[PDB]
Structures are given as C-alpha cells and as structure tokens.
C-alpha cells in the first residue's frame with residue numbers, strides 16, 4: 001500500500017484532477033486513500049479481501065464514454081478530498097464516512113450509458129444490487145468480520161447513499177437540505193446525518209464541475225456522447241427521445257448552463273453553507289458556468305464547416 | 314492544337330442541339346460540361362448573328378475563345394466556368410429581353426465579349442488584397458482604382474494582339490476603337506465600387522424611362538446589364554446559389570488566411586473565424602444583388618422573374634440560417650473548439 005504522498009504531492013488538494021492518474025494506478029490509489037483515512041486499521045479490513053473487492057468493483061464498470069471506472073474513481077477521490085479538507089469526523093460517524101467512500105466506488109456499477117427513462121430509481125437500485133453481488137462473491141466480502149449490527153448498518157447506508165445519486169431523490173429532499181443548512185447541522189440529529197450523507201454523495205457525483213475548465217469541458221464531451229448514443233438507440237427502436245438525448249435537437253450551451261445553474265451550483269451552495277471551507281468549490285462551479293456562457297457563441301458556425309461544404313443546408 | 318482541332322472540326326453546333334432549354338432563364342450553364350463550353354460560346358455568337366454581322370473569321374474566333382478560356386486560372390469561383398456562365402446570361406438577356414430595341418449591335422457584341430473576358434487571370438483575391446500584398450497588379454494599377462478590372466481588360470487586349478486571335482482585325486478604324494472603348498468601360502463596370510458610384514444615375518434612368526437616343530442611357534444600361542450578368546448565379550435555383558456561395562466563401566476565406574499570414578487584419582467577410590455566412594449572404598442579396606435585378610425589372614418588365622428568383626433565394630437563405638447553430642456535437646465528436 002503506497003503512501004498517499006507518493007502518488008502526488010497535491011493528491012489531497014481540491015485542485016487535483018484524479019483523471020490525471022493513469023487507470024492502471026487507480027486501484028492502488030483507492031487502497032492508499034482507505035489507508036490514509038485509517039479505515040483499514042479501524043475496521044480491521046483484510047487487505048487481500050480489500051484488493052479483490054476493489055478489482056471486482058473496477059471490473060463491474062463497463063466502458064461507456066462517461067459512466068465508467070474512471071468516473072467511479074474520480075467520485076471516490078472527491079469523497080477522500082471532503083474527508084481531508086472539511087473534517088467530516090466532526091459531523092459524521094466513522095462507519096458513515098466509510099459507507100460513503102465505498103458507496104462512491106460502487107454507485108454506478110454496471111452502468112450501460114443509459115438513464116432511468118431508457119430502461120423508481122431503476123439504475124440506482126441496480127447499482128446497489130451489483131455492489132451486494134460483489135460483496136457476496138467469494139473472497140470479496142470486506143465486511144464479513146463485521147458484527148451483525150454493523151453489517152446491516154453498512155448495507156443500509158450503502159443502499160441509502162447509492163439511492164441518493166438519483167436526481168429525483170435529491171429534488172425530493174432539497175427543501176430538507178435547505179432547512180438543515182439554515183438552522184445549522186446538529187450532530188445529535190440522525191435525520192441530519194442521513195441528509196448530509198445524501199448531499200455529500202451528490203457533491204461527489206458532480207465533482208467534475210469543481211475542477212478547471214479542461215475537466216468540465218472534457219466531461220461535457222463524454223456526457224453528451226453518452227446522451228446522444230442513447231437517443232440514437234431510442235430512434236432505432238422507433239421512440240421519440242428527449243431533446244437533450246437527440247443530437248439533432250440538443251443545444252449544448254443551454255443544456256449545460258441549466259444543469260450548472262439549477263442542479264450543480266445549488267448542491268455546492270448548500271455544501272458551502274454547511275462547511276465554510278467548501279466555499280472554493282462553489283466558486284469554481286460558478287466560474288466554470290461563466291466560462292460556458294463565454295464560449296456559447298462558438299456553437300454558431302462562423303465561416304464554413306471543417307467540411308468546406310454547405311451540403312448540410 | 315488538340316483543343317483547337319476539336320473546336321474547329323466539330324462545326325458550329327446550333328443552340329437547340331446543346332439543350333432545348335438553352336435560351337431559357339431557368340437553364341443553368343454550369344450543367345454544361347467544361348469541354349463543351351467553347352463550342353457553346355461559338356453557338357451563342359452564331360445565334361445572335363454576330364459572326365455574319367461583323368464577318369468574323371471563324372478560325373480566328375475559335376482561337377480567340379480558347380485563348381480566353383486558357384487565360385482563366387482555377388480558383389474556386391473566379392474560373393472559366395464563371396466567365397462562361399456570365400456570358401451565357403448575357404445571351405439570355407439578348408434572347409429574352411430583346412436588347413436590339415435598346416442597344417446598338419456593336420454594344421451588345423461588346424457586352425458579350427466583355428462577359429467572356431471580364432475576370433481574365435483572376436487569382437481569387439479582390440482589389441484591396443492587391444494593394445495589401447503589394448502585387449505587380451497594384452504597382453501597375455493602384456493609383457487608378459479598379460486594380461483587377463484594369464488587369465482583366467489589359468489581359469483581353471493582350472489576347473487580341475496575340476497572332477491569330479484578333480477577332481476585330483477586319484473592323485474599321487472607327488468600329489475598332491469603339492469596341493476597345495466599350496470593352497474597357499464594360500469590364501470596369503464589374504467593380505462594385507463603380508456600380509455604387511453610378512447607382513443614383515441608374516435609379517434615375519429606371520424611373521424616367523430608357524431613351525434610346527440618350528448616349529448616357531446606353532452607357533448606364535451596359536453597366537447595369539454587365540453587373541446583372543456578373544451576379545446571375547443568384548437568379549437560378551437554390552442549388553446554384555448554395556453551391557456558388559460555397560465557392561465564393563472558399564475564395565474569400567483563402568484570401569483572409571493570406572492576409573493574416575502577411576500580418577494584416579482581414580475584413581470580417583474574409584475572416585473564417587469571424588464571418589457569419591447567413592448575415593453576409595443576406596446583406597449581399599438585399600443590398601447589392603436585389604436592387605440590380607429590381608432596376609433591370611423596372612427597365613424590362615420581362616426581367617421580373619429574375620428579381621423574383623433572387624428574392625426567393627434570399628428568403629431560402631433566411632429559412633436555413635438556423636442551421637449555422639451547432640445542435641449536438643460537431644462532426645468531430647469533440648468540444649476542443651471551445
């Protein structure tokens with residue numbers, strides 16, 4: 001188990017981009033993060049079992065453009081950053097933070113690059129079921145020495161956290177999140193623990209928006225590749241895809257800016273309200289959104305297309 | 314010799330044999346293969362009776378036509394097929410508007426020959442570029458204005474004074490000078506700057522009515538007709554206007570690239586990173602092309618269909634303007650362009 005500092009001197013910073021790490025080093029980085037959070041010693045996790053678990057989780061991701069292992073790794077890395085930078089131990093129990101990290105690793109398992117509509121929370125229930133199947137694969141149960149009580153806690157936490165990655169769920173609990181942010185977190189309120197875990201999970205899921213322009217632009221490319229692939233499949237089946245899935249109707253600037261203003265930014269705003277040290281995350285999302293507005297004009301073709309042809313009219 | 318032999322040993326084809334619709338405003342001369350265009354030029358001159366009228370030596374005319382064809386380079390738009398299409402339109406105006414009621418035979422003959430010659434040795438660059446690039450043409454003509462148009466005329470003169478190519482060498486001294494003066498004035502009228510200077514005079518003439526005894530009206534009409542021929546790709550169907558726009562913008566943006574490489578700032582319409590084709594195309598059509606065909610309609614009621622076609626093509630450009638906004642990802646499948 002490599003010490004975290006040996007991966008990169010900036011590895012525990014909010015400025016670090018985990019997609020910079022080559023894919024063949026990510027499983028070792030997962031182990032290094034768990035070691036640095038002390039969960040291996042805390043929960044007496046068998047290291048061979050943990051290695052097998054991590055590789056099985058990695059193998060349980062398919063290779064669509066966005067919802068692949070590197071997404072899961074990047075989300076898990078952000079969870080680690082929240083631990084290292086926001087001092088989550090003042091707000092959550094060790095088992096809750098451990099569940100959050102493991103949920104991050106597992107939360108999109110077996111994603112096919114299609115959404116719930118293409119198939120409540122259909123995909124998120126599947127991701128959880130896949131995580132369960134891995135745990136019950138011989139040699140991969142990292143929790144098999146847990147007490148009956150802690151085992152059920154861990155399974156309940158993982159289910160609730162993975163289910164919180166559905167936008168529909170987030171929108172249902174949004175008023176409860178705002179209320180908590182307003183009144184202030186209460187470490188003795190079990191609802192506040194549950195709500196905070198949901199918020200943190202969504203903050204990890206969307207963490208590509210908190211990096212530089214390069215990341216938000218490149219991830220947008222992967223996202224729209226996935227969306228439009230789904231729309232193509234829907235059209236081939238004879239069905240009418242939503243505008244954001246239809247490459248002949250989708251207008252990326254509008255879709256991207258709306259997503260950032262109305263979904264991403266309010267999550268990082270809430271996170272800022274609960275953790276002053278999360279302020280730089282909200283500012284980076286707002287900055288990236290401003291950048292999207294600035295480059296919106298580039299979707300209007302100036303000159304001729306690269307084709308050198310007006311056949312498209 | 315080979316192109317000559319083919320032009321000379323294929324006899325002067327009657328125009329009807331080229332196409333049954335050859336004398337119609339709906340005909341697209343770019344549909345004719347390039348290897349048949351020289352014979353078509355001869356057929357048109359024969360059908361307008363200029364060969365018999367002026368007793369033109371047919372071998373000399375064949376040589377002249379092939380030399381003119383050879384004097385065009387191959388940029389995207391300003392090539393022989395442009396000159397041919399412009400000459401064809403001049404022929405259409407003769408066949409459809411009865412130009413013999415307005416102009417002298419020598420004036421109509423000069424117009425057609427001017428159409429053939431009017432962009433000779435064009436390099437796909439405009440007058441401004443010649444000055445900016447300090448070309449040989451700028452050195453020769455920049456103090457006089459209309460740099461390229463003076464060059465086109467000089468090229469036409471050089472062809473006429475090439476042995477075996479002087480189609481006017483049996484003209485009287487009076488008719489020879491007249492022909493050279495007409496060719497100069499008509500070729501100079503293809504500069505947009507010239508057209509914009511005379512525009513108020515053209516409007517005046519259109520309003521008061523053409524007067525066949527007014528020599529200024531003859532001169533103004535020839536200018537208008539020449540510009541009507543130069544822009545005649547706008548009077549055909551959507552396919553032509555769209556395809557010609559492609560060639561035009563390729564030429565414009567190639568020039569802008571050269572200007573940037575020289576360190577200069579190109580006009581927005583020459584800059585592929587700033588030019589917005591719908592806006593440029595619609596403005597050109599509304600403010601340059603349509604008023605020319607409006608004037609032509611005012612002077613010739615039978616030219617009404619030309620104006621209507623230009624206005625219709627402009628409406629089509631407005632309708633497809635929205636397609637210049639990228640929906641989905643680019644064909645590249647990449648957002649690197651941001």
Ligand SMILES: Cc1ncn(-c2nc3c(C(=O)N[C@@H](c4ccc(OC(F)(F)F)cc4)C(C)(C)O)cnn3cc2C)n1
Nearest residue numbers: 164165166167170202203205206220223255256259263
């Ligand atoms: C209306 C709509 N739906 C998705 N949209 C976009 N999503 C994205 C994402 C992203 O990461 N989207 C995931 C996600 C994951 C959890 C989620 O819920 C919660 F609670 F975290 F906000 C919402 C979105 C994804 C791909 C599953 O939609 C990146 N760029 N981008 C652009 C757009 C237009 N817009």
Ligand SMILES: Cc1ncn(-c2nc3c(C(=O)N[C@@H](c4ccc(OC(F)(F)F)cc4)C(C)(C)O)cnn3cc2C)n1
Nearest residue numbers: 502503504505508540541543544558561593594597601
């Ligand atoms: C301000 C400006 N200048 C040129 N513009 C455009 N020109 C064209 C033409 C065309 O045929 N242009 C020639 C021409 C030739 C004689 C001429 O003078 C006169 F008197 F006939 F109007 C004007 C234009 C060309 C290529 C030489 O500019 C086709 N599409 N198109 C689009 C635009 C935006 N716009």
Ligand SMILES: [Mg+2]
Nearest residue numbers: 107108165166
């Ligand atoms: Mg998901």
Ligand SMILES: [Mg+2]
Nearest residue numbers: 431432461503
């Ligand atoms: Mg010209």
Ligand SMILES: [Mg+2]
Nearest residue numbers: 519520521522
């Ligand atoms: Mg009147």
Ligand SMILES: [Zn+2]
Nearest residue numbers: 071107108205
């Ligand atoms: Zn995810």
Ligand SMILES: [Zn+2]
Nearest residue numbers: 395431432543
């Ligand atoms: Zn021309």
